[PDB]
Design an enzyme around this catalytic site. Sequence first.
Site, PDB file in Angstrom:
ATOM      1  N   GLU A 175      23.094   3.141  62.993  1.00  0.00           N
ATOM      2  CA  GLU A 175      23.704   3.981  64.008  1.00  0.00           C
ATOM      3  C   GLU A 175      25.208   3.796  64.146  1.00  0.00           C
ATOM      4  O   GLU A 175      25.675   2.693  64.440  1.00  0.00           O
ATOM      5  CB  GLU A 175      23.039   3.724  65.372  1.00  0.00           C
ATOM      6  N   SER A 211      25.532  10.511  68.509  1.00  0.00           N
ATOM      7  CA  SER A 211      24.839   9.484  67.734  1.00  0.00           C
ATOM      8  C   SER A 211      24.675   9.984  66.306  1.00  0.00           C
ATOM      9  O   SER A 211      24.248  11.123  66.069  1.00  0.00           O
ATOM     10  CB  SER A 211      23.471   9.193  68.341  1.00  0.00           C
TER      11      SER A 211
END
Length: 202
Positions: free
Chosen positions: A171, A131
């Site tokens: 993200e 991530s």
Amino acid sequence: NTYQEFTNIDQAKAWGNAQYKKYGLSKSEKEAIVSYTKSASEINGKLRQNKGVINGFPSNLIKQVELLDKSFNKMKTPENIMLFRGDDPAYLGTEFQNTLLNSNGTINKTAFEKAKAKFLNKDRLEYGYISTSLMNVSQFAGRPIITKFKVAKGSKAGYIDPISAFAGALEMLLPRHSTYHIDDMRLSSDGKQIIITATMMG
């Protein structure tokens, strides 16, 4: 080469949002990603413990992992891009857990030296998904390690933010079993963080 670094949240959002509408993710793919943002730590934790072997996992999870993997056929960055990530001390190893940080919140320089010896100019394999964020967002201002990944044009990378259960992270997700090579490690201006520059491989 040159790597696009977003310096503005609204510009990051608009570019990311535009990438996402082109992906054309299946319904199942989207569900797997939504679920990943809710339970990433569990998923990545199982991937690290088992060194990428998913055979023993529950069948719901095997299915989820295969769907996240398959999603990266549709999710490639169209340009060289810099991505960002905040990490706590255990990221460098068990030895760093309670030794990286001084009492006053600065990076201990001796632990910094063992980290540079251990990691500088070396490849690193990550079993979990990675991530990241399009910017050095405030969610990880409290974190002692900041990594800047240089991700080449055409590399697997997806803006999953529109369907994350959580807000504010800009993200971008990278695939599991990625290798990156740590090019640089320095202390930050205020001495409270280690800045790591890395080049993402396949």
